[PDB]
Design a protein around this motif. Structure first.
Motif, PDB file in Angstrom:
ATOM      1  N   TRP A   9       0.702  -1.252   0.013  1.00  0.00           N
ATOM      2  CA  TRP A   9      -0.042  -0.148   0.138  1.00  0.00           C
ATOM      3  C   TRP A   9       0.834   1.153   0.003  1.00  0.00           C
ATOM      4  O   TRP A   9       0.567   2.549  -0.454  1.00  0.00           O
ATOM      5  CB  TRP A   9      -0.926   0.037   1.299  1.00  0.00           C
ATOM      6  CG  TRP A   9      -2.117   1.114   1.253  1.00  0.00           C
ATOM      7  CD1 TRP A   9      -2.219   2.232   1.691  1.00  0.00           C
ATOM      8  CD2 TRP A   9      -2.957   1.070   0.076  1.00  0.00           C
ATOM      9  NE1 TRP A   9      -3.100   2.935   1.264  1.00  0.00           N
ATOM     10  CE2 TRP A   9      -3.952   2.317   0.352  1.00  0.00           C
ATOM     11  CE3 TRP A   9      -3.447   0.341  -0.785  1.00  0.00           C
ATOM     12  CZ2 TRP A   9      -5.065   2.571  -0.328  1.00  0.00           C
ATOM     13  CZ3 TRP A   9      -4.666   0.327  -1.503  1.00  0.00           C
ATOM     14  CH2 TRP A   9      -5.299   1.768  -1.319  1.00  0.00           C
ATOM     15  N   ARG A  11      -4.511  -2.980   0.560  1.00  0.00           N
ATOM     16  CA  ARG A  11      -4.668  -2.127   1.885  1.00  0.00           C
ATOM     17  C   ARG A  11      -4.022  -2.788   2.943  1.00  0.00           C
ATOM     18  O   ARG A  11      -4.044  -3.973   3.014  1.00  0.00           O
ATOM     19  CB  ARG A  11      -6.021  -1.731   2.124  1.00  0.00           C
ATOM     20  CG  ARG A  11      -6.791  -1.021   1.028  1.00  0.00           C
ATOM     21  CD  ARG A  11      -8.014  -0.674   1.202  1.00  0.00           C
ATOM     22  NE  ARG A  11      -8.766   0.000  -0.053  1.00  0.00           N
ATOM     23  CZ  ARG A  11      -9.099  -0.551  -1.229  1.00  0.00           C
ATOM     24  NH1 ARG A  11      -9.056  -1.892  -1.446  1.00  0.00           N
ATOM     25  NH2 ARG A  11      -9.396   0.225  -2.183  1.00  0.00           N
ATOM     26  N   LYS A  15      -4.016  -4.503   6.315  1.00  0.00           N
ATOM     27  CA  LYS A  15      -4.937  -5.376   6.882  1.00  0.00           C
ATOM     28  C   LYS A  15      -5.869  -5.971   6.082  1.00  0.00           C
ATOM     29  O   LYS A  15      -7.203  -6.336   6.427  1.00  0.00           O
ATOM     30  CB  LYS A  15      -5.479  -4.616   8.186  1.00  0.00           C
ATOM     31  CG  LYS A  15      -4.392  -4.722   9.267  1.00  0.00           C
ATOM     32  CD  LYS A  15      -4.172  -5.598  10.427  1.00  0.00           C
ATOM     33  CE  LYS A  15      -5.574  -5.472  11.389  1.00  0.00           C
ATOM     34  NZ  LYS A  15      -5.438  -4.129  12.036  1.00  0.00           N
ATOM     35  N   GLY A  16      -5.614  -5.602   4.510  1.00  0.00           N
ATOM     36  CA  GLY A  16      -6.752  -6.072   3.732  1.00  0.00           C
ATOM     37  C   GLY A  16      -6.614  -7.122   2.806  1.00  0.00           C
ATOM     38  O   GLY A  16      -7.191  -7.123   1.485  1.00  0.00           O
ATOM     39  N   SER A  37      -0.780  -6.604   3.645  1.00  0.00           N
ATOM     40  CA  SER A  37      -0.228  -6.026   2.340  1.00  0.00           C
ATOM     41  C   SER A  37       1.264  -6.286   2.044  1.00  0.00           C
ATOM     42  O   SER A  37       1.856  -6.577   2.911  1.00  0.00           O
ATOM     43  CB  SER A  37      -0.365  -4.251   2.407  1.00  0.00           C
ATOM     44  OG  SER A  37      -0.010  -3.583   1.327  1.00  0.00           O
TER      45      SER A  37
END
Ligand SMILES: CCCCNc1c(-c2ccc(OCC(=O)O)cc2)nc2ccc(Br)cn12
Ligand SMILES: CCCCNc1c(-c2ccc(OCC(=O)O)cc2)nc2ccc(Br)cn12
Ligand SMILES: CCCCNc1c(-c2ccc(OCC(=O)O)cc2)nc2ccc(Br)cn12
Ligand SMILES: CCCCNc1c(-c2ccc(OCC(=O)O)cc2)nc2ccc(Br)cn12
Ligand SMILES: C[S@](=O)(CC[C@H](N)C(=O)O)=NP(=O)(O)O
Ligand SMILES: C[S@](=O)(CC[C@H](N)C(=O)O)=NP(=O)(O)O
Ligand SMILES: C[S@](=O)(CC[C@H](N)C(=O)O)=NP(=O)(O)O
Ligand SMILES: C[S@](=O)(CC[C@H](N)C(=O)O)=NP(=O)(O)O
Ligand SMILES: [Cl-]
Ligand SMILES: [Cl-]
Ligand SMILES: [Cl-]
Ligand SMILES: [Cl-]
Ligand SMILES: [Mg+2]
Ligand SMILES: [Mg+2]
Ligand SMILES: [Mg+2]
Ligand SMILES: [Mg+2]
Ligand SMILES: [Mg+2]
Ligand SMILES: [Mg+2]
Ligand SMILES: [Mg+2]
Ligand SMILES: [Mg+2]
Ligand SMILES: [Mg+2]
Ligand SMILES: [Mg+2]
Ligand SMILES: [Mg+2]
Ligand SMILES: [Mg+2]
Ligand SMILES: [Mg+2]
Ligand SMILES: [Mg+2]
Lengths: 475, 475, 475, 243
Positions: free
Chosen positions: A158, A178, A180-181, A219
């Protein structure tokens, strides 16, 4: 498998070379190569020699020679080498007495399995591990008199959303992950589908029984691949080969993998969750319909052992300075010594598996992949066995988000250790559970403490951290 | 092997060219090429001419012409040349008398073996060698009036951890080798597995019997490949061919190899350990169950001879100025004249081989690959044989880490020589053991002394060292 | 000169700061600054403190505190500091007993002068020194695991004749100095006339009696400025101040000076010739119209002492590893141990001075500027006095070009030492002439030996020299 | 108070003289790895009625009972006192052997490896003093000087005897000898923990109050200790990238 099985495999596969492997104390596999022509019964009867003084945790220079004897169950074809190669793991032995070496990690695992049988508690200890990792594009770092740095990078990080071009000059096409995505959107957000398919395939072709593969929360290419559980020694051998297959599949495909616990500040660490269960005479021992989370007394007391002994046990399960950067709130890693069903904020989670007694198990979430799985699995087992033997009752489970406890409730719950020097200190002061039945010996424990202090703790402690300059340059 | 065998090989392999090789005095193989059509009985009957005045340690310009006669045992197909080529080593001879040349290194090894047999002590001297080397990516250096530099580089070198990109602009992917940490983690830390496999394959296709290959201790691609021992002349011939194959395998794959003793400061040097044993009438002489380290009186006396004569013997075994940068503490090279079982800090190590009399041997660890193996092996044998003849008792073994002795205790044991000029001075003053049986002659010894003084010692001595600027610019 | 004279100088010159200076053991002056308001009678009565453990050759850390007491004869105004500063040299004293420190070089010089008086031989030893130096533009150097370099540069350097532009981008205008061609053509070949004039002027304003200044033989800005001789201690204080004025005049004018013995390979070194003579009751002792080169017995025997003790004396006169790069033939530095009138290839030259008894003296040509002149001059005096006392006859003068002697004749003349470790070993073995009258003590000699071995000899010996790469990379 | 006002103004003058002449100054305890840190040695002496109290010709190092007990207080309270004298994470990078800063809790004349050195000052009673070598410049001089005073005064009031002086290179002691001497604290969080557990000597007379002590502890934990603890250190990548 037997010696002749291995000779038949080598002949059947037209193997050119045989890679002789063993584990150093800290947890890195070591190797040398012999030609197929030198791989004969003599390798099994007499063994092969090496310099024990160049291997970490092993011998002094004046007592350097050590011996290796092969383990035929570990023979597998290497997926990477152009010259066709058979990889075999070996046990380390004293070159005079031919006895197994007290600091061979693979020997610790063997001893642990035999001690388990000798207690009468169970005959088999199953370990199902989840070793997460990051698939990066680059890393660099250094440490000088007047400065120090590190930087890791990944196309999907990110921190690169604003990059004018990619590393190679090609256009930024977005779809970065992102913080934690990364768990777990479909491509093109998932930029590693093809590479993980190569990882899966290499594992399958090396005789792993695969369960699943996915992008993880982090990420910049966090990943996880799961293979089927096994008994302790086999699971630890499986872990070492998995790490080898992951790292080299990445390397051959232009990437660079790390298994370190916390490479990224402010995103998920990489854990090595260890699902564990005891079996005896072909039946499960962990299940009781009437227990909390369907756990038997045996299972609850094992848990009691893990949580009671954690303050010294983490010296083997969380064995690096970087480990303790992962044990911080908000990232699905533990911050205190509690068990709870369904609960990924806990130190031990009981996964939801229904009423099948054969699936009932505990997930110890504390451990990471930064050391030695032979030692980590063995240490976990010894902790659990001391729990069973002394009927150690864990504290009541806490079915809550453990990162969001009110300050007062948090205060009565023992926290995870803050840093490596505390667990090493504690291991030094209390390790009697590990020495039961001679599984860990005093020389092993003393070598481990010394190695960690001199080669890891002190070297980090004496070096100024970059954030000290942000805090203090202008004092 | 016979001339007719060599002609048949050349015929069967459809050889286009024959490469005529011999050794110069310092230890570099020399060559010219003849077409297949000129390779006939005459080459064996009459020999071939060269300019002996262009070869170091050979003739003056007014006595230039010299003669070469082939050694059919040494015929091997070249692995590298596109035009199919057969390589053959030759002996140098006087072009008038046709006698063997006193300064042909291959003649010295011949003479040594015949001398051995004449003493009645043994009929065969076996030499097993370990010639370590570095696989670098680049090297540059110069020497000018106002400045001098060298730089070696390697992708795996620890000095590159902080590099933003690799030399070709591609990303830094880590997994570089720590100083003293190259022995011997699995790939991808080991970045040379495929290339060492290519070396092993080329050796196997050139008729070597391989034993093993591995990364060595040094960062920046230190390596070692072992092939089976042989009697002295064959072993020296193998050594020269091995260096050629290693070097050119590296070259054809984008790398550059050095066998220099100490290319890196603060990391392991590269040695040429020589395992040695004497046999007579098909039976070993080195073994005695009752002796320290399983050694016979004959073995002990041979060791006595090596360690007694070391002060001058090192003029042939450690023959360069850079040799003495390797003989410093902390790098598994010798610093004093001790023998000891199992001890990689000693001058002579006795490897642990069990009770098999046929395996019992001594490892002389002082030698390096910087010179001439025909001369080194020959000088070692002569020292050993003098020890046996005079029953020279070695001093008691010292079973300690020899680098950790306090200074006052270190001083009580004879030290290795500090610099090349000391060993050349000593050779000049005491060399009678070498001239036994006419194995080494006075003209050889004097030529060697003169060459090293004029071409090595003095050129280094007159050039300011860069570290003198660090110490003294500001005096 | 008295304390009151210094207080008046400070007042009259409106001094803002006083710079307290003393000599460390190797030969570099040390300083701290006090405000003029703190320069009072207490400085003379009680002294000033410093950390003796941070000064090379002085104290261990647990006995660190030492004392300084001023020498009012050495007070001079600093030519360089914007804030008007008075420089004064101090003697080092034990802070408990207030006795002179045994490893204060200024104390050794003091003790040497008083010893001389106590013998009756003479009351004054005069020293006239010629400290050559190079005026360079730049220097850089380093030492790493995989590489090392140095480079000096100078606009006048012959290595730059081919430069497309100067360092600053301006045009190459030629008139660079040929190797060995710098002595001493007129400008513009001499590119340092104006800078040497500034050096001359700064020296004059600091109270030196100047004799001459000129370009020296070496390319790239070699220079020499001569001031009037003085008695031993004054002469040694003068030398230190001269080095300071030379280095800082250059620095303030954009250049960088080295006094190292051999900064350039293949061009002249920088010597420190020491003209010496003994007087008594205001009359000369060195002259006799009937002696060779008009030398008296006292002078001949002093020469005897110098040439006899040379093998240990050079430990103080030629005290660095780089010193021995200068002691090589063809550069008007000595290569063997003889004396000769008019002779710039000799170790001791008798300059041509005529019949004036007051001008008669010897030039010891061996010494360089790489060390400590207090110690150097004191050691020379003690050698000469040992010679006078034991009537050591020098071997006969050789009135020839000593670089061009036939081999037989040359081998009958004792050579200069080859290297620092040899002179240090010899000093350790034989230094009674130095300890006479307690002038040098055992602790001083032991500290010197130990410092040279640990901090200079060993550190150079363990570092590969760039020319070893030129010789041996391809072994 | 004048000394602490002087210190603040000195730092201002050093920093800005540097700044106006093209340079940049730091007072941080350890900006360079493998070279000397920057200390703030504090020479200390007590006087009453215009007369010095520290001198006794017959004492070790010319020290009076009052001086010896002040030193007792400093060395005894050191585990908590360093929260004010060595108040940053970077402080503890300086307290490592080989750099003329303290690594254990001893006093010794002439000794730059000790925690308290007694400089050699001869027999003038007005010059006799102790040099407390542990402190650095990374905190607050008003609080550091005050805290040192309170420690020493507690030592005098309770007549705390220091352990015997050790007149040796303290970085080079044999292991058994070394292990027998209390060490300096390893890290800030240890001294903060210790301050929290025992600060009564500081609150005496209300010189330090509980609200100041609690605010200090919380500030250091929240703004310094925890932020450095949660950030990976570059050397962890050197050690662990390839695990
Ligand atoms: C034969 C041993 C079965 C062990 N049980 C078990 C299982 C399991 C899951 C489902 C099962 O169902 C099949 C059945 O018995 O009907 C049986 C076993 N999965 C794990 C994962 C980690 C660990 Br540790 C143990 N696991
Ligand atoms: C036929 C000659 C055997 C020489 N022995 C011998 C061996 C050796 C090792 C094992 C052996 O076992 C086979 C047997 O005799 O049963 C026999 C010989 N290895 C080396 C290495 C270096 C050197 Br030098 C000698 N070596
Ligand atoms: C008063 C002492 C005169 C010393 N003589 C002396 C002289 C000297 C040169 C010329 C002199 O002539 C004047 C006279 O006496 O007529 C007197 C002395 N030059 C040097 C150089 C180096 C050294 Br060391 C001694 N030197
Ligand atoms: C009037 C107070 C004198 C204090 N003594 C004193 C002195 C001192 C040094 C020398 C002195 O001599 C003058 C005299 O009394 O004769 C008097 C005092 N220096 C320091 C440094 C730090 C500290 Br804390 C105290 N110091
Ligand atoms: C999604 S996660 O909870 C993430 C675990 C985290 N990376 C850790 O540090 O343990 N893992 P899993 O669901 O595979 O057990
Ligand atoms: C690991 S080592 O001891 C290293 C030897 C070192 N390179 C030297 O001899 O300089 N060699 P080996 O184990 O192959 O004998
Ligand atoms: C011209 S020279 O002979 C040169 C001396 C040389 N640089 C040396 O190394 O001693 N010096 P001088 O004439 O000043 O005595
Ligand atoms: C020379 S030193 O001992 C150096 C002290 C070091 N910088 C420290 O960290 O305390 N200081 P001083 O002699 O000024 O007391
Ligand atoms: Cl830690
Ligand atoms: Cl040499
Ligand atoms: Cl030397
Ligand atoms: Cl902390
Ligand atoms: Mg999972
Ligand atoms: Mg996961
Ligand atoms: Mg099994
Ligand atoms: Mg999990
Ligand atoms: Mg080997
Ligand atoms: Mg080796
Ligand atoms: Mg044969
Ligand atoms: Mg070996
Ligand atoms: Mg001159
Ligand atoms: Mg001159
Ligand atoms: Mg005078
Ligand atoms: Mg001269
Ligand atoms: Mg006031
Ligand atoms: Mg101080």
């Amino acid at each position: 498998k037997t010696p002749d099985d291995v000779f038949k495999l080598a002949k059947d596969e037209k193997v050119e070379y045989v890679d002789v492997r063993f584990c150093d104390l800290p947890g890195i596999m070591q190797h040398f190569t012999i030609p197929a022509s030198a791989f004969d019964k003599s390798v099994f009867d007499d063994g092969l020699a090496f310099d024990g003084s160049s291997i970490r945790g092993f011998q002094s220079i004046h007592e350097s020679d050590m011996l290796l004897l092969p383990d035929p169950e570990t023979a597998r074809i290497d997926p990477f080498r152009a010259a066709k190669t058979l990889n075999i793991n070996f046990f380390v032995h004293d070159p005079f007495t031919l006895e197994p070496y007290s600091r061979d990690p693979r020997n610790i695992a063997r001893k642990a399995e035999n001690y388990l049988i000798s207690t009468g508690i169970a005959d088999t200890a199953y370990f199902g591990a989840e070793a997460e990792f990051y698939i990066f594009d680059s890393v660099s770092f250094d440490s000088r008199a007047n400065g120090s740095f590190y930087e890791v990078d990944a196309i999907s990080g990110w921190w690169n959303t604003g990059a004018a071009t990619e590393a190679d000059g090609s256009p930024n096409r977005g779809y970065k992950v992102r913080h934690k995505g990364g768990y777990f959107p479909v491509a093109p957000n998932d930029q590693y589908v093809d590479l993980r398919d190569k990882m899966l395939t290499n594992l399958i072709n090396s005789g792993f029984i695969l369960e699943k593969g996915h992008h993880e929360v982090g990420s910049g290419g966090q990943a996880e691949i799961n293979y089927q559980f096994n008994s302790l020694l086999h699971a630890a051998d499986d872990m070492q080969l998995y790490k080898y297959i992951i790292k080299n599949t990445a390397w051959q495909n232009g990437k660079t993998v790390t298994f370190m616990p916390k490479p990224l500040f402010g995103d998920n660490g990489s854990g090595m969750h260890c699902h564990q269960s005891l079996w005896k005479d072909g039946a499960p021992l962990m299940y009781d319909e009437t227990g909390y989370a369907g756990l038997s007394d045996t299972a609850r007391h094992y848990i009691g052992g893990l949580l009671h002994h954690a303050p010294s046990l983490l010296a083997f399960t969380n064995p690096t300075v970087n480990s303790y950067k992962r044990l911080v709130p908000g990232y699905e890693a533990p911050i205190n010594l509690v068990y709870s069903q369904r609960n990924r904020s806990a130190c031990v989670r009981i996964p939801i598996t229904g009423s099948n007694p054969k699936a009932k198990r505990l997930e110890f979430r504390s451990p990471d992949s930064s050391g030695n799985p032979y030692l980590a699995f063995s240490a976990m087992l010894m902790a659990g066995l001391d729990g069973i033997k002394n009927k150690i009752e864990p504290q009541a489970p806490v079915d809550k988000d453990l990162y969001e406890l009110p300050p007062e409730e948090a205060a009565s719950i023992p926290q995870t250790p803050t840093q490596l020097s505390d667990v090493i200190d504690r291991l030094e002061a209390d390790h009697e559970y590990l020495t039961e039945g001679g599984v860990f010996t005093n020389d092993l424990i003393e070598t481990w403490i010394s190695f960690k202090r001199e080669n890891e703790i002190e070297p980090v402690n004496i070096r100024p951290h970059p954030y000290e300059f942000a805090l203090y340059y202008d004092v």
